[PDB]
Paper text:
All CDR loops except L3 contact PfRH5, with the predominant interaction mediated by H3. A high-resolution structure of unbound R5.011 Fab fragment was also determined and used, together with structures of R5.016 Fab fragment and PfRH5ΔNL, to provide model restraints. Binding is accompanied by a major change in the conformation of the H3 CDR loop of R5.011, which packs against residues Y155–D162. Indeed, live-cell imaging revealed that the time taken for merozoites to invade RBC is significantly longer (around 3-fold) in the presence of R5.011 versus a control mAb targeting Ebolavirus and versus non-neutralizing, non-potentiating anti-PfRH5 mAb R5.009.
The Plasmodium falciparum reticulocyte-binding protein homolog 5 (PfRH5) is the leading target for next-generation vaccines against the disease-causing blood-stage of malaria. A fundamental and non-redundant event in this process is the binding of P. falciparum reticulocyte-binding protein homolog 5 (PfRH5) on the merozoite to its host RBC receptor basigin (BSG) (Crosnier et al., 2011). Here, we examine a panel of human monoclonal antibodies (mAbs) to PfRH5, isolated from the first clinical trial of a PfRH5-based vaccine (Payne et al., 2017), to define critical mAb epitopes in atomic detail. We identified a subset of mAbs with neutralizing activity that bind to three distinct sites and another subset of mAbs that are non-functional, or even antagonistic to neutralizing antibodies.
Numbering used by the authors:
A (entry chain B): 2 to 210
B (entry chain A): 1 to 142, 149 to 228
């Protein structure tokens, strides 16, 4: 039995978010919803389509009919930003099934382009017969970015390692990407570029041996 | 007052086995089913299976057949998860969760089954890496200038970075570590300073990797 959820939902604070959960004849099954804030364990927020466990606010509601179950969240606060999962029990298999989850983003600030810093290999590392290009990405909002590396215009895929974005003290995000090369590979090109794509716009930085 | 408490983080080598515990309190352990759920990093919840707390009989989800074993110790109201022949893809947070309605509730068929109480989770890391102290490199600056330090190839986490023994704190971005395909970590710290790279306006980054007794003070010069 498959449960299908949209991967992403964005909401303005104070507005209402709607999260769907599709499944063949889902209306005939009891649907439950879990809220998982970052670094935390999931919490049951809705059970049996529309009931709330004690402590869950009235802003949280749900419905389930036909082929779609819905989690509705009214007057969305910054505190509601989390991943939401739906779940059912299948009487046929005796399995419990989860949907793929929906990331709920509460847009609490305007779009911010990433600030990018690119460092070439140090003299010390070059002496140890190694070469690392360090690309530091900060202050971007929303918290999603794509990184690509270039050498003499060519795409570099080998030796690339990029982090997931991380929430900073301001409510912006940071990330980093590393390109490992041999000293000879580093010196064999005229320039290397780190290209950071954010909401369709690319911020680029170049470094030369 | 229902509580599900899990054993601590565990680090294992590929091929080894783990045993994760889940201690229940505030309810009749033998009256409710215990479920096990997996969450690989940055991914969704996956149901692993359930165990009957009165009989010890387990039920596994598709694909969680073979290497996953549920067991109990009812006298101490504890449920166990065992994973054998560990692979790097078994790296996940494992949660245990109590299920409602209980075994003796007639509403089960029409109203069941939801996870009303969860454990805090147990992170199981599967890595072939051994303890390794990092190499620290200066990241020389090219009316503001950015300078930093690269803390390369260490294991395990954590490392701490401070600038000028703590006396420098404004303009400091210390970035979370990257996990490389080698199984080692790397991180960087960067400080934005006014362009007053005085011949002797010293910038030193202080790096600590406690699991390998590494303490490094690196001067960063233009
Ligand atoms: C210290 As900043 C404002 O570049 O995140």
């Amino acid at each position: 039995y498959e449960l299908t959820q949209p991967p992403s939902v964005s909401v303005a604070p104070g507005q209402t978010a709607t999260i769907t959960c599709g499944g063949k004849n889902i209306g005939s099954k009891s649907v439950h919803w879990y809220q998982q804030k970052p670094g935390q364990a999931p919490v049951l927020v809705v059970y049996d389509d529309s009931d709330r466990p004690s402590g869950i606010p009235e802003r949280f509601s749900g419905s389930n009919s036909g082929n779609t179950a819905t989690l509705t969240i009214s007057r969305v606060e910054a505190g509601d930003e989390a991943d939401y999962y739906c779940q059912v029990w299948d009487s046929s298999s005796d399995h419990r099934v989860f949907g793929g989850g929906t990331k709920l983003t509460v847009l609490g600030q305007p779009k911010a382009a990433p600030s990018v810093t690119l460092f070439p290999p140090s003299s010390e590392e070059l002496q140890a017969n190694k070469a690392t290009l360090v690309c530091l990405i900060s202050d971007f909002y929303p918290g999603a970015v794509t990184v690509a590396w270039k050498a003499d215009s060519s795409p570099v895929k080998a030796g690339v390692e990029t982090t997931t974005p991380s929430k900073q003290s301001n409510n912006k995000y940071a990330a980093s990407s590393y390109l490992s090369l041999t000293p000879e590979q580093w010196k064999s090109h005229r320039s290397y570029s780190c290209q950071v794509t954010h909401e369709g716009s690319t911020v680029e930085k170049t470094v030369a041996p | 007052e229902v509580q599900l408490v899990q054993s601590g983080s565990d680090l294992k080598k590929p091929g080894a086995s783990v045993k994760v515990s889940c201690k229940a309190s505030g309810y009749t352990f033998t009256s409710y089913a215990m479920n096990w759920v997996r969450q690989a990093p940055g991914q969704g919840l996956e149901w692993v299976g359930w165990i009957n707390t009165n009989t010890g009989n387990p039920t596994y989800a598709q694909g969680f057949t073979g290497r996953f074993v549920f067991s109990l110790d009812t006298s101490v109201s504890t449920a166990y998860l065992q994973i054998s022949s560990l692979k790097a893809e078994d790296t996940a947070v494992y949660y245990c969760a109590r299920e409602s309605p209980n075994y003796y509730d007639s509403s089960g068929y029409y109203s069941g089954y939801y996870f009303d109480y969860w454990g805090q989770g147990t992170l199981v890391t599967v890595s072939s890496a051994s303890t390794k102290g990092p190499s620290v490199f200066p990241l020389a600056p090219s009316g503001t200038a950015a300078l930093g330090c690269l803390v390369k190839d260490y294991f395990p986490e954590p490392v701490t970075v401070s600038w000028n023994s703590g006396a420098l704190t404004s303009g400091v971005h210390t970035f979370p570590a990257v996990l490389q395909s080698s199984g080692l970590y790397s991180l960087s710290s960067v400080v934005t300073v006014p362009s007053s790279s005085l011949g002797t306006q010293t910038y030193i980054c202080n790096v600590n990797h406690k699991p390998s007794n590494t303490k490094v003070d690196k001067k960063v010069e233009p």
